[PDB]
CSV table of C-alpha atoms and ligand atoms in Angstrom, one decimal:
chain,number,residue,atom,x,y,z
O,1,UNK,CA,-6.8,12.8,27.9
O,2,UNK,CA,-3.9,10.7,28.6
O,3,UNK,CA,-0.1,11.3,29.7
O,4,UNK,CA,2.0,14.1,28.2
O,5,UNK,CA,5.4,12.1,26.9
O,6,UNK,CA,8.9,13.7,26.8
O,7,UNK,CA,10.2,11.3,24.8
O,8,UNK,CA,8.2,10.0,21.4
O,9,UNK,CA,9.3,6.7,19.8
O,10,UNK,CA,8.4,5.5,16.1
O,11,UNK,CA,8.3,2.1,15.1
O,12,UNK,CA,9.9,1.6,11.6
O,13,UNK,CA,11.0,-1.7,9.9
O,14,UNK,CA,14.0,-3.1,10.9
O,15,UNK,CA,14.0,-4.2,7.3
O,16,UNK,CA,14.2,-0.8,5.9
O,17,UNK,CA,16.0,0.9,8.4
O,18,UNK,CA,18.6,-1.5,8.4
O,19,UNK,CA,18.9,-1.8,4.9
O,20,UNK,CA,21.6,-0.8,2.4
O,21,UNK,CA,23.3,0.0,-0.6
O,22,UNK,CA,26.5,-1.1,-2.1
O,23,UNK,CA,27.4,-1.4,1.7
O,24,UNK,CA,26.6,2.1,2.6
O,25,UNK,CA,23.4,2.4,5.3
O,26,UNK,CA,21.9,5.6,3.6
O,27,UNK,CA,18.6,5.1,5.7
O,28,UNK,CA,19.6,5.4,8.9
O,29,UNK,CA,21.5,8.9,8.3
O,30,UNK,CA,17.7,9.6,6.0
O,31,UNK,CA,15.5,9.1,9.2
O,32,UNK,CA,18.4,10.8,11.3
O,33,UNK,CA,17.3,14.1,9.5
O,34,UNK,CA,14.0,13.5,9.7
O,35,UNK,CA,14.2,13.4,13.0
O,36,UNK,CA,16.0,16.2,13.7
O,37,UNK,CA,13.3,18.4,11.7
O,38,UNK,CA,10.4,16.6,13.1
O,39,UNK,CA,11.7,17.5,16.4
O,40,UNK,CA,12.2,21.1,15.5
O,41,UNK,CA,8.7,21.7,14.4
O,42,UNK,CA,7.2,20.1,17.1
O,43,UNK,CA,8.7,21.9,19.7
O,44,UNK,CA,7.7,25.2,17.7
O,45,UNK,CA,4.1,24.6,17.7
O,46,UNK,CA,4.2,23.1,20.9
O,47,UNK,CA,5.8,26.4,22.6
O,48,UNK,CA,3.5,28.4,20.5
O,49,UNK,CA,0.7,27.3,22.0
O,50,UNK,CA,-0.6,28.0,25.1
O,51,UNK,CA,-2.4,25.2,25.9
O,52,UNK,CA,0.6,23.5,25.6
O,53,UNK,CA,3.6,25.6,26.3
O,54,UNK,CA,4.3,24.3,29.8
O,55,UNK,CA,5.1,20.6,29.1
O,56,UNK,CA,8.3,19.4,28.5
O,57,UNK,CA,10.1,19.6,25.0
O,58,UNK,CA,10.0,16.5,23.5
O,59,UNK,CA,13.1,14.3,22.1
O,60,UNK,CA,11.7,12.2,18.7
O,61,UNK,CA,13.4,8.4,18.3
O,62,UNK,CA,12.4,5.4,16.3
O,63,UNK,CA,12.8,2.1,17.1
O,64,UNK,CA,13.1,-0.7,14.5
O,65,UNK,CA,10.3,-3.4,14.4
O,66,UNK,CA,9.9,-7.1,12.8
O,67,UNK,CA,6.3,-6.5,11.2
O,68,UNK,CA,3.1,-5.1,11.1
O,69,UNK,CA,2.0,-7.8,13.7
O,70,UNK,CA,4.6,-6.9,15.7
O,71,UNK,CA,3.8,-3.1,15.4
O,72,UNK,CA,0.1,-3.5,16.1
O,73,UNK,CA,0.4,-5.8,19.2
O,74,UNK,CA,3.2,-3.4,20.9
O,75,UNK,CA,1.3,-0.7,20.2
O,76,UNK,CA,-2.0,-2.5,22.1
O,77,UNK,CA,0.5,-2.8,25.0
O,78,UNK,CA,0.8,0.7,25.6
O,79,UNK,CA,4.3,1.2,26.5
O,80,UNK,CA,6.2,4.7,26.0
O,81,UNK,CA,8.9,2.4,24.7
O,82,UNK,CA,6.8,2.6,21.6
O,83,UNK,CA,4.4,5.3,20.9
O,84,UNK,CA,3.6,5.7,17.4
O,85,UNK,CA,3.8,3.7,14.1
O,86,UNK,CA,2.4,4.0,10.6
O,87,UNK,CA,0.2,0.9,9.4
O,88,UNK,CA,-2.1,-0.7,6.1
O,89,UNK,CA,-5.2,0.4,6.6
O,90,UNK,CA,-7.0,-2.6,6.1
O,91,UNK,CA,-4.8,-4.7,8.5
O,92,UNK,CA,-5.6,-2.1,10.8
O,93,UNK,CA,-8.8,-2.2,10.6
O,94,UNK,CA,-9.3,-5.7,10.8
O,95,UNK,CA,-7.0,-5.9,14.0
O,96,UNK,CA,-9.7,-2.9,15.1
O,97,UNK,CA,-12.6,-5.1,15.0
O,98,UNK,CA,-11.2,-7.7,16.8
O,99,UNK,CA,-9.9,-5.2,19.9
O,100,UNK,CA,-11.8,-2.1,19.8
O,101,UNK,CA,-10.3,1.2,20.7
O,102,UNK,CA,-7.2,-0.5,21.9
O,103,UNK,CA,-5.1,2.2,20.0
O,104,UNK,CA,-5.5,5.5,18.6
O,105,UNK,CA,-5.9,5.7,14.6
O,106,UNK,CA,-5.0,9.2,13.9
O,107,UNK,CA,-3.0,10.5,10.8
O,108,UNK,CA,-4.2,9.2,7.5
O,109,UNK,CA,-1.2,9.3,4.7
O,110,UNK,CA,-1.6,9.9,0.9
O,111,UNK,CA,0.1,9.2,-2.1
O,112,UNK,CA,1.2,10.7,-5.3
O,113,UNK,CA,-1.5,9.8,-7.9
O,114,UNK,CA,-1.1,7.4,-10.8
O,115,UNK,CA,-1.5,9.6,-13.7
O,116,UNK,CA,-4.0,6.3,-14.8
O,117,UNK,CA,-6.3,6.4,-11.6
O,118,UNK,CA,-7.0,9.9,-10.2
O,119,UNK,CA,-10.0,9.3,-9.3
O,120,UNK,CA,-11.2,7.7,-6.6
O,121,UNK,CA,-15.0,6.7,-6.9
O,122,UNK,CA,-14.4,3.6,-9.3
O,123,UNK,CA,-15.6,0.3,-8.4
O,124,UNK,CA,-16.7,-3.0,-9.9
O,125,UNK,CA,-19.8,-2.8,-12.0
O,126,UNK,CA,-19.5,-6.1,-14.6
O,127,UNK,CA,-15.9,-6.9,-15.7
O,128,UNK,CA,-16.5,-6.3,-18.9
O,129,UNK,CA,-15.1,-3.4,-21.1
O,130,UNK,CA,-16.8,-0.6,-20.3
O,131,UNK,CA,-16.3,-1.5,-16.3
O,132,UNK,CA,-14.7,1.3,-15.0
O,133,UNK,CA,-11.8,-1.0,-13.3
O,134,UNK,CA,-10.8,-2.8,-16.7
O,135,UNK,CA,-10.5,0.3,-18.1
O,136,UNK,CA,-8.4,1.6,-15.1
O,137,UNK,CA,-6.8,-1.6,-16.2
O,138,UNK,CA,-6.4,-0.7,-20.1
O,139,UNK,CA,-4.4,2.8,-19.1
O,140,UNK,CA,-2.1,0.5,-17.4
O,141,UNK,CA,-1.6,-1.5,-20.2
O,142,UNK,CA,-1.0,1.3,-22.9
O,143,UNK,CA,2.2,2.8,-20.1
O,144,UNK,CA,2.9,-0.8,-19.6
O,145,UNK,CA,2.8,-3.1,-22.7
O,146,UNK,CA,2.8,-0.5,-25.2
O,147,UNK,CA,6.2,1.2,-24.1
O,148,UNK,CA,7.2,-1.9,-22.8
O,149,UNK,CA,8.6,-1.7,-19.7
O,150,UNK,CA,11.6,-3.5,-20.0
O,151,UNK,CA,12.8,-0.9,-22.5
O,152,UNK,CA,11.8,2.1,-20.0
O,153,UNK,CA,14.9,4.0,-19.4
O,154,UNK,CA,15.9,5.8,-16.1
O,155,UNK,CA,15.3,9.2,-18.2
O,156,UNK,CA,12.5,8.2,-20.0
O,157,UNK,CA,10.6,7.7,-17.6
O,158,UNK,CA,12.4,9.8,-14.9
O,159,UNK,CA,14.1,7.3,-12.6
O,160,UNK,CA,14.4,9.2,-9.3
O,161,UNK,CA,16.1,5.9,-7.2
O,162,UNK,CA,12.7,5.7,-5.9
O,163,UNK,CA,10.0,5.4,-8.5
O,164,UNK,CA,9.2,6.0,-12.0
O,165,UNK,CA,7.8,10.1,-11.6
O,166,UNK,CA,6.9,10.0,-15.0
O,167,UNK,CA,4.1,7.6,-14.0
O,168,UNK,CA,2.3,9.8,-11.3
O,169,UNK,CA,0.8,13.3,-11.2
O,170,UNK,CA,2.2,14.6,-8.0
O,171,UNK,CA,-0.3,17.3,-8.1
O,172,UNK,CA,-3.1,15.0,-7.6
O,173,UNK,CA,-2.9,13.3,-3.8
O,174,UNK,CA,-4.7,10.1,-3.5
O,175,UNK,CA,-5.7,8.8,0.1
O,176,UNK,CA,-6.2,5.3,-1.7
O,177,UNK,CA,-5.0,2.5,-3.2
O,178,UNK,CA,-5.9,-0.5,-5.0
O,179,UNK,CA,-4.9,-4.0,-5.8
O,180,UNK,CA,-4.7,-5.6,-9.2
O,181,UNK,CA,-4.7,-8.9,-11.4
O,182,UNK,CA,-2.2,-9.6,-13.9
O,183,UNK,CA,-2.1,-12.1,-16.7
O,184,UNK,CA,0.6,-13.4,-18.8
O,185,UNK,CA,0.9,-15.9,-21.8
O,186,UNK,CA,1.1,-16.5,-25.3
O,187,UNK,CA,-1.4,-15.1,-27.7
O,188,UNK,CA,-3.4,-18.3,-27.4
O,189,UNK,CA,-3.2,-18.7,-23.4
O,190,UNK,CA,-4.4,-14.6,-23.2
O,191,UNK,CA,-7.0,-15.1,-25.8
O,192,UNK,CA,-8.6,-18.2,-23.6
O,193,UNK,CA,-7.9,-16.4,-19.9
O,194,UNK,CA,-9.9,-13.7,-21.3
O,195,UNK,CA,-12.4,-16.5,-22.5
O,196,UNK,CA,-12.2,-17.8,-19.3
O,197,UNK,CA,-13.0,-14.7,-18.0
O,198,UNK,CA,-15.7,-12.9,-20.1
O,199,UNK,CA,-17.9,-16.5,-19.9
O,200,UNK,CA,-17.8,-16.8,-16.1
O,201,UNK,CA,-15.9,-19.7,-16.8
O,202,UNK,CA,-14.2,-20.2,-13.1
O,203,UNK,CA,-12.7,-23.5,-13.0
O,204,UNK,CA,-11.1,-23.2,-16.2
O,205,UNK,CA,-9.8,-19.4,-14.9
O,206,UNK,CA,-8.4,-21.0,-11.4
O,207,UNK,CA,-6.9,-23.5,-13.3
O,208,UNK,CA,-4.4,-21.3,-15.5
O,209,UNK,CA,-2.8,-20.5,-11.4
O,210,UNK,CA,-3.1,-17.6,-9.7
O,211,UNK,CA,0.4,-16.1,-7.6
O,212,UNK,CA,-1.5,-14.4,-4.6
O,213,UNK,CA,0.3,-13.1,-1.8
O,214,UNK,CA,0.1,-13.4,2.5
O,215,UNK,CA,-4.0,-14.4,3.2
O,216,UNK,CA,-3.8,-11.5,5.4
O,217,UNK,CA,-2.8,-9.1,2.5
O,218,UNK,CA,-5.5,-6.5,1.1
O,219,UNK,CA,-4.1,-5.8,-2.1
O,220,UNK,CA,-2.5,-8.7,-2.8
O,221,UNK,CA,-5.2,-10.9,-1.4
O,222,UNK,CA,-8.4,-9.9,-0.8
O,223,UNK,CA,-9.0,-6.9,-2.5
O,224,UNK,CA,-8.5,-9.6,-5.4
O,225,UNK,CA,-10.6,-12.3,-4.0
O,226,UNK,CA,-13.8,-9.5,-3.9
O,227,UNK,CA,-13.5,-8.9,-7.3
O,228,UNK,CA,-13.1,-12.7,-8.3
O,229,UNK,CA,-16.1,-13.6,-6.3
O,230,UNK,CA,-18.6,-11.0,-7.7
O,231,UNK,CA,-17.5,-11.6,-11.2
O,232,UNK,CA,-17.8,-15.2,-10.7
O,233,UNK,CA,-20.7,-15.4,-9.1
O,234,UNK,CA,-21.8,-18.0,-7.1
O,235,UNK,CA,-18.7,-20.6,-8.3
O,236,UNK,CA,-16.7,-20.7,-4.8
O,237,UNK,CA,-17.4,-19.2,-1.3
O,238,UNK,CA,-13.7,-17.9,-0.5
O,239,UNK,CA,-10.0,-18.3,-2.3
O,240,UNK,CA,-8.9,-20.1,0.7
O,241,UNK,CA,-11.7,-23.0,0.5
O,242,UNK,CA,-11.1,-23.1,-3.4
O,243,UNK,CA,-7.2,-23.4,-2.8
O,244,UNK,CA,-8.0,-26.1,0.0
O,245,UNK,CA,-9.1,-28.5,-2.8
O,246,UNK,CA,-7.5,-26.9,-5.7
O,247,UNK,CA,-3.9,-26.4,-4.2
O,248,UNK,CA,-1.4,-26.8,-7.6
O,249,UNK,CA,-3.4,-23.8,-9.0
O,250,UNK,CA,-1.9,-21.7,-6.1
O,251,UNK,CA,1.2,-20.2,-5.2
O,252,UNK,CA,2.2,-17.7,-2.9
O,253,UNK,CA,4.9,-15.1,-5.0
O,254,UNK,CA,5.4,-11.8,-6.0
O,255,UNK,CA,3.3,-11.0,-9.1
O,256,UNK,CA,7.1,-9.8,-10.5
O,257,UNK,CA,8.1,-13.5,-11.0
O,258,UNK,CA,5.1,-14.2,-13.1
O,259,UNK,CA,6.9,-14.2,-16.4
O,260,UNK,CA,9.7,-17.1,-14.9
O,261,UNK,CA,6.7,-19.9,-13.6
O,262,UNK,CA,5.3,-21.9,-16.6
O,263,UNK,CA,2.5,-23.2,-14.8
O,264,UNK,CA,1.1,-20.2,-13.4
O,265,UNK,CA,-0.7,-16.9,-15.6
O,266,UNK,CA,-2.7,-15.0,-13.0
O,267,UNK,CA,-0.8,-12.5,-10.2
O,268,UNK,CA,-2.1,-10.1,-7.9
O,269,UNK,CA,-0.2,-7.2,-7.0
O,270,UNK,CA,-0.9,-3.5,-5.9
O,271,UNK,CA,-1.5,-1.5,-8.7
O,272,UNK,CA,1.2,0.6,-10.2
O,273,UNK,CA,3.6,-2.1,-8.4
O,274,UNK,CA,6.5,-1.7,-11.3
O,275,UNK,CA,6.4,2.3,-10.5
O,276,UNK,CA,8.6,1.9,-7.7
O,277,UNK,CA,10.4,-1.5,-9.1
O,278,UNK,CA,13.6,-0.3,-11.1
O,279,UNK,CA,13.5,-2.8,-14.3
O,280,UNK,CA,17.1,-2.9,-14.1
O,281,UNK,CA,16.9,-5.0,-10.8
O,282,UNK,CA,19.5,-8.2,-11.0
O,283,UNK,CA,15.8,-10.1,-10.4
O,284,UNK,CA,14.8,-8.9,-13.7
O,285,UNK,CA,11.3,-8.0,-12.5
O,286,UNK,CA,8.2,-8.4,-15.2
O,287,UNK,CA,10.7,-10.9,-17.3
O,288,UNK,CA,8.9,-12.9,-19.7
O,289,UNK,CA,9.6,-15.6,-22.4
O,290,UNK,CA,9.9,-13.6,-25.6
O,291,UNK,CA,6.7,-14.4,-27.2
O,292,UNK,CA,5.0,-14.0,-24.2
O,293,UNK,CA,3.4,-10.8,-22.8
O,294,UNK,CA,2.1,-9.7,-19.3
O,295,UNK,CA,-0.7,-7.3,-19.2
O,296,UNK,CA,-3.3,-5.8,-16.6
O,297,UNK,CA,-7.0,-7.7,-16.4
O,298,UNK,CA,-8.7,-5.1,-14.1
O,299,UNK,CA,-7.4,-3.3,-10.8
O,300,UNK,CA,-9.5,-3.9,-7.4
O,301,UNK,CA,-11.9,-1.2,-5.4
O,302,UNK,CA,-9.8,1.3,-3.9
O,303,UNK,CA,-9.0,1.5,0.2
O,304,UNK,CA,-7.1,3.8,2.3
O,305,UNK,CA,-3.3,4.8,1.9
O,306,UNK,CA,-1.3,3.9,5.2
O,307,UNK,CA,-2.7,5.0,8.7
O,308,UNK,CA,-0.6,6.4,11.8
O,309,UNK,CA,-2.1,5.5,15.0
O,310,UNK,CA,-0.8,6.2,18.3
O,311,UNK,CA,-0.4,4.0,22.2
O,312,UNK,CA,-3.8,5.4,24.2
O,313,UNK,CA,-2.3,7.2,26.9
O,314,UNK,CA,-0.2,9.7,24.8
O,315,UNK,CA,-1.6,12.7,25.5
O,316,UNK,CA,-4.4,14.0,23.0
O,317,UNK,CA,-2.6,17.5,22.8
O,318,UNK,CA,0.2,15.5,21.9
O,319,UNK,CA,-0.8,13.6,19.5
O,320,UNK,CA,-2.6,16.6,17.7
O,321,UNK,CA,0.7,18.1,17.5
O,322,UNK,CA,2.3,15.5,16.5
O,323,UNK,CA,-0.1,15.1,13.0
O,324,UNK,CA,0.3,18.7,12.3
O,325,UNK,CA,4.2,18.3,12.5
O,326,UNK,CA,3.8,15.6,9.7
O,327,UNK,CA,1.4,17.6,7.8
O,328,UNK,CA,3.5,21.0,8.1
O,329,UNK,CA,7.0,18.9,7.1
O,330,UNK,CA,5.4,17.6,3.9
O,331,UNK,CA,4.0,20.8,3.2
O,332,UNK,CA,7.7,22.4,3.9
O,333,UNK,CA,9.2,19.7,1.7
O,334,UNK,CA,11.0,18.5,4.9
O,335,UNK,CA,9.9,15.6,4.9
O,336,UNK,CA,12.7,12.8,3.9
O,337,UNK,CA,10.9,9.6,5.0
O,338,UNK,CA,7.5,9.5,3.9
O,339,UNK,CA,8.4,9.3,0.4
O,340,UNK,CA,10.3,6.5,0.2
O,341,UNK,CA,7.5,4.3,1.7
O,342,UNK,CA,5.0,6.2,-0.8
O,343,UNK,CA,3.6,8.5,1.6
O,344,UNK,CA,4.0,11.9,-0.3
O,345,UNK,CA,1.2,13.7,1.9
O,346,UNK,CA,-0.8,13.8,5.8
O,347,UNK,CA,-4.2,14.3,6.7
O,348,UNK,CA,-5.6,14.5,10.1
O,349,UNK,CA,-8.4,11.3,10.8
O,350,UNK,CA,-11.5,13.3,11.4
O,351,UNK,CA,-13.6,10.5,11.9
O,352,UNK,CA,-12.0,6.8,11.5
O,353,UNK,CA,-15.5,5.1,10.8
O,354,UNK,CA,-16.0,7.2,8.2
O,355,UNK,CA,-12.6,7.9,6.3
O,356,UNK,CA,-11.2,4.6,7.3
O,357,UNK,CA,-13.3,1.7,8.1
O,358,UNK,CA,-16.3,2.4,5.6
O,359,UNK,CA,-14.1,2.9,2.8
O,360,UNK,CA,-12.6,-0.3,3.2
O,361,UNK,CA,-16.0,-2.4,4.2
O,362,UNK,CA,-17.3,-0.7,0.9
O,363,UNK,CA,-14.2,-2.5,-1.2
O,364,UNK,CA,-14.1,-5.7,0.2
O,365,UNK,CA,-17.7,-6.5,0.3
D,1,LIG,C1,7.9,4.7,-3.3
D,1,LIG,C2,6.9,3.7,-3.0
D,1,LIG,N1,5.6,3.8,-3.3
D,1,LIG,C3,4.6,2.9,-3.1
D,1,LIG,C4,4.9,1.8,-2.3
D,1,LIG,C5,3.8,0.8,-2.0
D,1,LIG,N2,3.0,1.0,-0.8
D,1,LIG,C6,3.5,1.7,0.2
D,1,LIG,S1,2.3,1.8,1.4
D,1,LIG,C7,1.2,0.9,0.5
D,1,LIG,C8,-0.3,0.6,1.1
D,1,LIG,C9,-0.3,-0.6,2.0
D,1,LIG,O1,0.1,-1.7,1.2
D,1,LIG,P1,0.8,-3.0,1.9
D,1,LIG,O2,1.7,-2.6,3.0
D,1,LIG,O3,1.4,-3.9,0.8
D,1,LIG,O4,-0.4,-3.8,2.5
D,1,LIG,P2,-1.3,-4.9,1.8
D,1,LIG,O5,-2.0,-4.3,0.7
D,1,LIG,O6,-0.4,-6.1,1.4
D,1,LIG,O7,-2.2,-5.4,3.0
D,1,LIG,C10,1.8,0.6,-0.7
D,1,LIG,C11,1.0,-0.3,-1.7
D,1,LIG,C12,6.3,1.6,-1.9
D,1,LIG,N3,6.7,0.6,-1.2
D,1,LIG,N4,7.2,2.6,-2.2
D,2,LIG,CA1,7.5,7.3,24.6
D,3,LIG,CL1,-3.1,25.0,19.6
């Protein structure tokens, strides 16, 4: 059942944590609180119960980490140095396959829906217009392209210094999240991608350049690369053999710097990406030419939100504990962490196989 642990570390990225604004570090005083409730709760439930009343209180730290890689691996180590850290689910569940049950998936998070995909159960049938994803895809485009985004104000669309609320429907928790393809061009260059597109046409698609992101990447990546392959059937066995032979019609960059790169039209992104990207940004995200527009082809399948898994040897009351403490914060509104990373809910992982690794087997194949 493992080792009761006094002292509980998180891993969070040294990226966010020692980030800034204007020279102020506003998230290490953020976490500071959220540690201070966390620990609060926990001990409440903790000396509540009797099962569990007789261990030590326990103090709550993070720790800042590199990346993912480096979360997963110290993790698999098993040291109380690090206990606990939140991941994407489908690099966790590849780095699962390859070393089974070295760690402990065990808190799933979820996310404030897009008010344009509430529902979950929509997945690739033919690409064309009545495909459930292109018309995920045409919602995107009306918020998108007919308000254009670039005029969006931060009360129009109610700004919060995190995302774009009036884009979600925080009444509605998703536990998933998809990928998506962008295109961009003149009238003529649209017209033809879409060509290119409804005809199956592949090397004349590829050849308009896709931005893609990390190979490792779900939803900038493959969630992408599934849809590309079923629609063009047959006409390459993965993106990385294509790109191998067909490199100038590949680049790795954020779909946001689609409108500055001439030679490129395709991105993949995570849906929704601009919801959280403040078009006032000095980057001048989503910028195009002025006769040129950038619109949504057709989002991905959809896969699980972020997933917290634990070390192996922290104690199984312990960790049960420790997922109702982030479920009861959210539910308190005490939680200030989760939503600046998107995570605006908890749910317990009943059974990983099911909620987790099926899900995401199911989008990708
Ligand atoms: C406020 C806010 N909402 C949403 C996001 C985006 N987001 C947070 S967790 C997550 C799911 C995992 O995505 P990612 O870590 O990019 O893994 P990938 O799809 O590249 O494998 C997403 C898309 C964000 N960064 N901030
Ligand atoms: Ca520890
Ligand atoms: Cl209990």
């Amino acid at each position: 059942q493992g080792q009761w642990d006094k002292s509980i570390t998180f891993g969070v990225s040294e990226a966010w944590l020692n980030k800034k604004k204007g020279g102020e570090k506003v998230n290490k005083e953020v976490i500071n609180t959220f540690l201070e409730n966390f620990k609060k709760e926990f001990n409440k439930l903790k000396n509540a119960n009797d099962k569990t009343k007789n261990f030590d209180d326990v103090d709550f730290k993070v720790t800042p980490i590199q990346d993912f890689t480096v979360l997963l691996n110290n993790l698999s180590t098993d040291n109380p140095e690090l206990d606990f850290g939140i991941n994407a689910s489908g690099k966790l569940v590849e780095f699962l396959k390859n070393n089974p049950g070295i760690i402990t998936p065990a808190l799933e998070t979820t996310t404030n829906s897009f008010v344009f995909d509430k529902e979950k159960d929509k997945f690739y049938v033919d690409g064309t217009d009545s495909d459930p994803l292109v018309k995920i895809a045409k919602e995107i485009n009306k918020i998108f392209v007919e308000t254009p985004y670039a005029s969006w104000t931060d009360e129009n669309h109610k700004w919060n210094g995190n995302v774009y609320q009036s884009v979600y429907d925080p009444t509605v928790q998703a536990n998933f999240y998809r990928g998506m393809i962008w295109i961009k061009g003149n009238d003529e260059t649209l017209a033809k991608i879409k060509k290119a597109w409804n005809d199956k046409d592949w090397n004349t698609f590829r050849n308009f350049g896709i931005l893609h992101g990390k190979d490792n990447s779900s939803s900038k990546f493959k969630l992408e690369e599934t849809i590309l392959k079923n629609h063009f059937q047959n006409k390459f066995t993965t993106l990385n053999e294509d790109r191998s032979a067909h490199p100038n019609a590949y680049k790795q960059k954020s779909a946001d710097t689609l409108g500055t790169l001439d030679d490129f039209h395709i991105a993949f992104s995570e849906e929704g990406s601009f919801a959280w990207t403040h078009n006032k940004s000095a980057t001048k995200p989503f910028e195009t030419k002025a006769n040129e527009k950038m619109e949504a082809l057709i989002v991905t399948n959809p896969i699980p939100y972020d997933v917290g898994v634990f070390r192996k040897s922290v104690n199984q009351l312990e960790q049960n504990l420790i997922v109702q403490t982030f479920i009861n914060l959210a539910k308190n509104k005490q939680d200030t962490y989760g939503p600046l990373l998107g995570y605006n809910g908890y749910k317990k992982i009943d059974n990983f196989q099911k909620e987790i690794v099926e899900v995401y087997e199911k989008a990708i194949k």
